[PDB]
Symmetry: C2
Subunit: 236 residues, 2 copies
């Protein structure tokens, strides 16, 4: 019985940082989970609102992309790249074929995830069928408006989750940018929908939480842990 | 509430393991928090149900006690040992003089913490005063019967905590002992008092949670982080 994971990527790719660089998909937030799922025998399908995506340019730096990751990123024939090439649009997805819905991030998610009704329906269906919903970094942005098909309440209401920290936005000096673009942080979303936000000791620590079948991670360093947790949570 | 910490130690110190070794206070669960508090400018008072304690013999092994820790442990003139010499009984404690109540562990806590009503009242008072209640490893055994003075409900009811894992007990082969001695695991306590137990990915990982002013850690590897968390939590 083929075990499948639907890995969502932000479709937003545009100038964002003060240095003029663009945000978009944080490379390892897509690559590490991909590797973890593949290692465990899962098949992985990528998807974005538009079927297209761009890389967060800061995530391309050597500190965030090196060694085997860089090699896989550069090799056109890598499993990673060949799979990315087959990226789907929400309309091409059949929710019932997946056991796990994983939302990778990068600041780009703040632009499209909150309004991605079709991806939210897919995540909601996967969750209603006993599957797992997981998200790392700014991925929880997609929880804004995500409803639990069985209860009708926000899927994260009364749940414990983590995600990119407010302090992290401040340390990066992007908090003023978020305010200017009328974007909400992960902690903002958690507060709005009645979720309990639990923070890491430090903003860049590998930190993740498993609350039943809802799994969340804080940042790039938490991508792998988030993926591992989503696999383990299938028995929850 | 002066910058002072009350660090609780288990008073149980009897043969426990299959090899005949005794359990008791897990050295680094007392030492690491002690160093962290002292480093941040806090005065620290030790306390145990009987005013006495013994070391968990497995925690004395090189893998758990080495380097500077071993040096401080052996140095009879260390600030650690001089403070341990002044260990108090619950009756010699004034709850109003502490900002933080910290429960260190080792398997010994499973024997005395659940019935340590006097220490629980102290913890409850500190918490009611706006202070922090923290526990690491089996320390959450202290939460069995702990009441929130403001509501009359279990202090951990509706709260998210972590602590030593059931799987960890099985791996160590101590589950058979717990069953024989009619002891409850941390996860058992969490369920009995309405708390949400959030688990680490692996039983030995450095993992901790901050839920307002209630802080918890999973094991020896998490003692330092739990102490760090208890200090940062003083603003909740």
């Amino acid at each position: 019985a083929p075990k499948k994971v639907l890995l969502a990527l932000t479709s937003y790719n545009d100038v964002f940082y003060s240095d003029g660089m663009k945000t978009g998909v944080f490379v390892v937030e897509a690559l590490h989970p991909f590797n973890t799922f593949r290692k465990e025998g899962f098949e992985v399908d990528f998807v974005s609102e538009t079927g297209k995506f761009g890389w967060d340019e800061h995530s391309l730096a050597k500190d965030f992309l090196n060694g085997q990751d860089e090699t896989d990123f550069k090799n056109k024939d890598s499993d990673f790249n060949k799979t990315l090439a087959k990226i789907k649009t929400p309309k091409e997805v059949n929710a019932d074929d997946y056991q796990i819905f994983m939302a990778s991030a990068g600041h780009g998610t703040l632009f499209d995830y909150p309004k991605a009704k079709d991806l939210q329906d897919i995540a909601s269906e996967i969750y209603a069928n006993g599957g797992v919903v997981a998200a790392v970094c700014h991925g929880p942005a997609m929880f804004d408006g995500l409803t639990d098909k069985k209860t009708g309440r926000p899927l994260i209401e009364g749940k414990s989750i983590t995600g990119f920290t407010d302090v992290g936005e401040t340390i990066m000096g992007v908090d003023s940018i978020l305010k200017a673009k009328n974007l909400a942080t992960v902690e903002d979303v958690a507060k709005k929908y009645g979720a309990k936000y639990l923070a890491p000791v430090g903003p860049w620590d590998d930190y993740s939480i498993t609350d039943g079948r809802l799994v969340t991670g804080v940042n790039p360093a938490s991508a792998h842990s988030t993926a591992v947790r989503s696999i383990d949570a299938l028995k929850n």
